[PDB]
């Protein structure tokens, strides 16, 4: 509805247009007759300077520039789940269907959601009820798994006057609110600018451990609901398998996957393999509770930069409903490459290694938007966003700007190691380099919910692994046969932790997930063997006698990971067999 601009200069990716005085800074625009994607970067009088994120070949002065009247935003409403978008929320599936081509034609504008699809709206609020931002007026059963809750938008406050259940599109008025500005109509869709965080009541501490079912993570390097984790992704380290495991096993309601700016054939893999992931509970596709952002390297730089922001806005939207969301970004190194490109195109003073000087701030803005919160509304419901982010530096060096600024604001680091993958140790998480700053608080939670000394076990478990590193250097130098019985034992207990606990097959029907209860029982027996054998050594027994005497029971420990969740006693009863077997050894 605002004034259309007129191009006065085309110079590479830079376009100047007069008659733009009604537009705003950071507005998205359609440039030229074709109407290619651009953005208003500067304004001098009525003259806007525009960065164009598609080819400007064939464009010249006199052609129109139309502002979209808003900064980069997303459509949020029924029809968003199970869809694949790019960084600027272009509906990739719809582009195939409508345009009848395999290409993303320059100038083609299609709405992010389906504005013609009928949905059954179920009203859950009575007329005459006072409402404000966040209040749920009803819901739509959007997928086979997820119920989409229709909330009062931010900026709206008043009394519900008219509402009823029925079939509607996301453009139909489903509700009438008596506000201060008079009667207004609500629909099932609301818009939101991706760079602005959706408002909350209160940000809370993320102190409840996520259950991923992956033993190395839940036990030694736990992330909480609302926490954040960085994961380096070297080739051949099994990153995608770890990602898939976390996406389908974690106790969250929705997953938002973000492909930032990936190699074309690598992005295709994700497009292929992700819908093939099965939701453990319902047996449905994971897409039934997933939103996916897919950018290849040749997507507009604006879509590659906006990738994680578009994704977290969507996560915030479902968070506001009272859901737990996992946002999984890969790779944030490629997102930062888009920032580096933009910095050079804007002719800025560069920060470290060509990255903008505000790289650290942009990362802080993203990660501080994840977290556990009290959402707006009279319910005061809680939601959370847990962020899992891949980084992929050129040489695999951590000290580079992207990973370094990330680790300043996240508390969890899962160090995938390609040398461990070459030793058939999966998942390839380096237990020495990795860390979780949630360990101490998770430990308090676990001790309470288990009524066990779980934190003592975890720290003891790590201590044996730490001492193993030291002992291995001696074995390499002096030789294995020159160690004391106590040291030989420590190496065996550490070997059991690595093999019987840390190593976990994602493709095995039972080993793919380990319950919190099962993890406790498994770590218990492994440590109990170490405890009993060490007590046997100090009672006069010899290390080899203990090993040769406990072949049967140590195999029970090695097969513990394959014990079904219904038969957890078959792990727990190993404890008695250890004490009894070693007792006979001390005797004989």
């Amino acid at each position: 509805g605002m004034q259309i601009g007129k191009i006065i200069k085309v110079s590479g990716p830079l376009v100047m247009a007069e008659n733009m005085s009604e537009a705003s800074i950071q507005d998205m625009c359609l440039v030229g007759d074709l109407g290619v994607i651009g953005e208003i970067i500067e304004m001098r009088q009525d003259v806007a300077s525009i960065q164009v994120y598609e080819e400007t070949s064939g464009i010249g002065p006199g052609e129109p520039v139309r502002s979209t009247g808003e900064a980069l935003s997303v459509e949020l409403g029924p029809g968003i789940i199970s869809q694949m978008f790019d960084g600027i929320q272009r509906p990739l599936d719809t582009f195939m269907e409508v345009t009848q081509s395999n290409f993303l034609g320059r100038g083609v504008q299609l709405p992010a959601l389906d504005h013609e699809k009928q949905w059954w709206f179920e009203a859950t609020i009575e007329e005459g009820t006072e409402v404000s931002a966040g209040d749920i007026i009803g819901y739509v059963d959007e997928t086979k798994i997820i119920q989409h809750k229709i909330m009062v938008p931010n900026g709206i406050k008043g009394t519900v006057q008219k509402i009823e259940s029925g079939s509607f599109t996301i453009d139909d008025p489903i509700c009438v609110i008596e506000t201060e500005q008079g009667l207004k109509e609500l629909t099932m869709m609301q818009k939101w600018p991706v760079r602005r965080g959706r408002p909350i009541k209160q940000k809370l501490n993320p102190d409840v451990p996520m259950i991923t079912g992956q033993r190395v993570i839940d036990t030694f390097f736990p992330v909480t609901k609302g926490g954040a984790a960085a994961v380096p992704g070297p080739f051949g380290a099994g990153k995608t398998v770890v990602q898939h495991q976390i996406a389908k096993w974690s106790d969250v309601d929705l997953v938002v996957y973000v492909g930032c700016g990936e190699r074309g054939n690598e992005m295709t893999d994700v497009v292929n393999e992700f819908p093939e992931l099965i939701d453990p509970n319902t047996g449905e596709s994971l897409m039934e509770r997933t939103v996916l952002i897919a950018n290849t390297s040749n997507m507009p730089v604006a879509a590659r930069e906006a990738s994680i922001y578009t994704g977290i806005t969507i996560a915030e939207y479902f968070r506001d409903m009272g859901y737990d969301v996992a946002i999984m970004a890969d790779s944030t190194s490629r997102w930062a490459e888009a920032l580096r490109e933009m910095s050079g195109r804007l002719e800025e003073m560069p920060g470290d290694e060509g990255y903008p000087a505000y790289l650290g701030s942009r990362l802080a803005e993203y990660y501080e938007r994840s977290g556990r919160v009290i959402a707006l509304g009279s319910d005061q419901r809680e939601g959370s966003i847990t962020a899992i982010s891949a980084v992929s530096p050129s040489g695999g060096d951590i000290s580079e700007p992207v990973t370094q600024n990330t680790l300043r604001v996240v508390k969890v680091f899962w160090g995938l190691d390609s040398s461990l993958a070459q030793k058939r140790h999966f998942p390839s998480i380096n237990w020495i380099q990795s860390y979780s700053l949630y360990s101490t608080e998770v430990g308090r939670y676990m001790d309470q919910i288990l009524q066990q000394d779980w934190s003592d076990m975890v720290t003891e478990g790590m201590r044996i692994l730490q001492e193993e590193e030291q002992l291995n250097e001696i074995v390499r130098l002096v030789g294995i046969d020159s160690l004391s019985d106590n040291d030989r034992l420590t190496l065996e207990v550490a070997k059991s932790i690595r093999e019987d606990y840390l190593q976990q097959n994602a493709f095995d029907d039972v080993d793919t997930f380990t319950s919190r209860e099962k993890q406790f029982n498994m770590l218990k027996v492994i440590l109990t063997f170490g405890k009993e054998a060490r007590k046997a050594l100090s009672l006069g027994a010899y290390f080899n006698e203990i090993m040769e005497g406990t072949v049967a029971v140590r195999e029970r420990i090695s097969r513990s990971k394959y014990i079904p969740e219904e038969e957890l006693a078959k792990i727990s009863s190993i404890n008695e067999e250890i004490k009894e077997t070693i007792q006979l050894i001390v005797s004989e």
Binding site: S21, E22, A23, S24, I25, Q26, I41, E42, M43, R44, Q45, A71, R195, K203, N205, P206, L346, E348, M349, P350, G351, D352, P356, A357, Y358, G360, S361, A364, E365, Y367, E368, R369, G371, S399, L407, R408, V409, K411
Partner: protein
């Protein structure tokens, strides 16, 4: 109020047809949608004013927005009711507390103390930390920073000093001003919960600035804090301890702002005026002749790549009066706090020790403990490279001394407060390990009286 915004280029904005606008004057932008953003005049020329908006220029429509020139620079509304209250980087309430009624408003740049009016830092502040109180004594009016690194427990040390710090034989005139700069929500929550749990909040003013807050707000933060401190010290007569972390986030924000203005970058990319800028903060510490009260500062910073020659710790060290160094070697040994006394120093320590301030044996034992520990560490390193048989019988004693010094003296725990009397007595216990003939830094009168 002007409706004459002419240009917007990034976070920068040009306003024309103005009069009576001054350098550094605060401005207020009323957007076309009623939204209000504040800014600052960076430069004023004829009828034009170049301004930077704190919250950025995204979404601003030029022709339908207006600018108000407020007629004053950035200010803090000060009151004695600030004690026990939590504010953000710009001095706005953050604790849902009652209305704050300012006695007056103060330019957050403050004023420069006349060098002739300045009083030398004097008298003892008991931090409760042995490695500090004894060997690197904190004096009233001193600037004494903590140099740390990523993953080191400087946040636990900061909170420990904040609740334990006190002046002896002087009741109800000590206050702590705590400034958090560019830190995450969760580390802000750590500090907030600790202060409230221990009751340290009741004698503190807190300014909490977060990592995702505007970079200009991050650099305003320490000036808001110091303005509050000077008011409490010089106008209310209080001894005020100012603790600020992380100064590395402050310098990063400064570099971000500098780059936005496309200024010529100095060493390692930081502004050429980094030294001067840090000095305008750190020199607000001190005492004034004829006035009751003092401002003492403990800036806390992480050394990038553990590099002490990096511009942030380097320029800080050229400004401050010593430094407290935390090391990974001691942290990995479980020493709390992991203070390495060998590179650590307090330059003004003489003004806060001795009879009437701490005790008469303060300086002698300090000289002796430092000397014995350096010799002990030297003997330890000799045993590493050449073996245990490379040490003399005396070298073995000094090596054992350095172990107990680290394990029992420096290591005290993050929730343990030691009085200066307890610290000094504990120092004599360790010195007793050594032969009396080896205590060459202590005269016989002190040895005869104190040596156990």
């Amino acid at each position: 109020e002007y409706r004459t915004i002419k240009e917007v280029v990034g976070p920068l904005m040009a306003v024309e047809k103005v009069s009576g606008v001054k350098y550094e004057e605060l401005i207020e932008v009323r957007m076309q949608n009623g939204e209000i953003r504040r800014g600052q005049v960076l430069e004023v020329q004829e009828d034009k004013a170049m301004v930077q908006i704190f919250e950025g220029t995204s979404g601003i429509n030029l022709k339908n927005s207006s600018v108000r020139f407020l007629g004053h620079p950035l200010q803090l509304g000060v009151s004695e009711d600030m004690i026990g209250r939590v504010f953000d980087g710009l001095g706005r309430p953050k604790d849902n507390g009652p209305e704050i009624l300012p006695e007056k408003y103060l330019d957050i740049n403050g004023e420069v103390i006349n060098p002739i009016a300045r009083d030398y830092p004097d008298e003892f502040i008991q931090t409760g930390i042995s490695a500090i109180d004894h060997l690197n004594t904190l004096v009233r009016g001193q600037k004494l920073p903590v140099f740390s690194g990523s993953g080191l427990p400087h946040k636990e040390l900061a909170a420990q000093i904040a609740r334990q710090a006190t002046v002896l034989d002087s009741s109800d005139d000590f206050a702590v001003v705590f400034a958090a700069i560019g830190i995450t929500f969760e580390e802000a929550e750590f500090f907030m919960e600790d202060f409230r749990q221990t009751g340290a909040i009741d004698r503190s003013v807190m300014f909490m600035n977060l990592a995702n807050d505007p970079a200009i707000e991050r650099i305003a933060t320490p000036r808001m804090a110091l303005t509050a401190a000077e008011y409490l010290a010089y106008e209310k007569g209080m001894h005020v301890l100012v603790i600020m972390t992380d100064m590395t986030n402050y310098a990063e924000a400064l570099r971000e702002i500098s780059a936005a203005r496309r200024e010529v970058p100095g060493r390692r990319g930081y502004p050429g005026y980094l030294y001067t800028n840090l000095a305008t903060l750190f020199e607000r510490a001190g005492r004034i002749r004829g006035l009751k009260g003092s401002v003492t500062q403990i800036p806390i910073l992480t050394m990038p790549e553990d590099d002490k020659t990096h511009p942030i710790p380097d320029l800080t060290g050229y400004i401050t009066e010593g430094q407290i160094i935390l090391t990974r070697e001691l942290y990995k040994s479980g020493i709390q706090p992991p203070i390495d006394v060998l590179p650590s120093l307090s330059r003004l320590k003489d003004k806060g020790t001795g009879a009437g301030k701490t005790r008469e044996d303060h300086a002698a034992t300090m000289n002796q403990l430092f000397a014995a520990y350096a010799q002990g560490k030297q003997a330890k390193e000799l045993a590493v490279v050449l073996g245990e048989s490379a040490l003399s019988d005396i070298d073995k004693i000094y090596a054992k001394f350095a172990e107990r010094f680290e394990n029992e003296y420096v290591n005290q725990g993050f929730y343990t407060n030691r009085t200066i009397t307890e610290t000094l007595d504990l120092g004599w216990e360790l010195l007793a390990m050594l032969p009396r003939t080896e205590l060459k830094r202590i005269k016989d009168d002190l040895l005869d009286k104190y040596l156990p």
